[PDB]
Amino acid sequence: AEFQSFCSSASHSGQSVKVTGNKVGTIGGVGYELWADSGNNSATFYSDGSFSCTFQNAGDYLCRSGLSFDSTKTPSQIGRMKADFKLVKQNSSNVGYSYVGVYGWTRSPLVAYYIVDNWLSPFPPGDWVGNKKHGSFTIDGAQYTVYENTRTGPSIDGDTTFNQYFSIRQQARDCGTIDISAHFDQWEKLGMTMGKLHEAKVLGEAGNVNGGASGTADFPYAKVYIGD
Ligand SMILES: O[C@@H]1[C@@H](O)[C@H](O[C@@H]2CO[C@@H](O[C@@H]3CO[C@@H](O)[C@H](O)[C@H]3O)[C@H](O)[C@H]2O)OC[C@H]1O
Numbered sequence: 001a002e003f004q005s006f007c008s009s010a011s012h013s014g015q016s017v018k019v020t021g022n023k024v025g026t027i028g029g030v031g032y033e034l035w036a037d038s039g040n041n042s043a044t045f046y047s048d049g050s051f052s053c054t055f056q057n058a059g060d061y062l063c064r065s066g067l068s069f070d071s072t073k074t075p076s077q078i079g080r081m082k083a084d085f086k087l088v089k090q091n092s093s094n095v096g097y098s099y100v101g102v103y104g105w106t107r108s109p110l111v112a113y114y115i116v117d118n119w120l121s122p123f124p125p126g127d128w129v130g131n132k133k134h135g136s137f138t139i140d141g142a143q144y145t146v147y148e149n150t151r152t153g154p155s156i157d158g159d160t161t162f163n164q165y166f167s168i169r170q171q172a173r174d175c176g177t178i179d180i181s182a183h184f185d186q187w188e189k190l191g192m193t194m195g196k197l198h199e200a201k202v203l204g205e206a207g208n209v210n211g212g213a214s215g216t217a218d219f220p221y222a223k224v225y226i227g228d
């Protein structure tokens, strides 16, 4: 079978919570966060892990659901991790950049990381995503471009500077399983070490460096887990 079974059956189930300001919480046993720097935005999170996103006139908007840790353990200490996801794109406009896939942070060192399988922007992210282009790698059965960046901006520690790690899929995928730890393994070979893990979540991010992005996105499947 070319695809995962959840690609055929995914739909929103369970109890839900709609948030319309910056907010971290849990719904059932899944961690969620809405974060934006501006705009009239929302997100609806379901106890089955799935979620949906709206953004209006935003500079940078993130909606994410999955695992929240306490920044005490490296990924290797936590265990091997994966995320199952299904994205359904909807209408959007003035989306200058966007990432869809898995996202999180470490501390010690402070790093934001992305495994990007799709994007709400008209075109995929380009070489501007990072100052260091490590090149093309076969990771988790597919071709990804790996980048490292240094960014000054908001963070889980407040406004500061931090490295970012990216794997950008060369061919968009709208449904499947990301082997998160396989990306971590590749990054380590390239000098991109993971600190103590803060989170690992399915993410939709959309933004624009000058204007204000608007649109919606649906994630009828999103499940992040420790195991196989
Ligand atoms: O981690 C996120 C960053 O990746 C994001 O960085 C901005 C991404 O957009 C960059 O500008 C692009 C230049 O190329 C044009 O064709 C695109 O339309 C532009 O978006 C900008 O330089 C980066 O800073 O910032 C938000 C972070 O969460």
Ligand SMILES: O[C@@H]1[C@@H](O)[C@H](O[C@@H]2CO[C@@H](O)[C@H](O)[C@H]2O)OC[C@H]1O
Residues within 6 Å of the ligand: 022, 033, 035, 062, 154, 155, 156, 157, 158
């Ligand atoms: O109140 C602060 C939040 O605004 C901050 O949120 C993080 C900011 O950087 C973004 O890239 C992250 O996604 C977001 O979680 O977290 C720290 C908190 O004190």
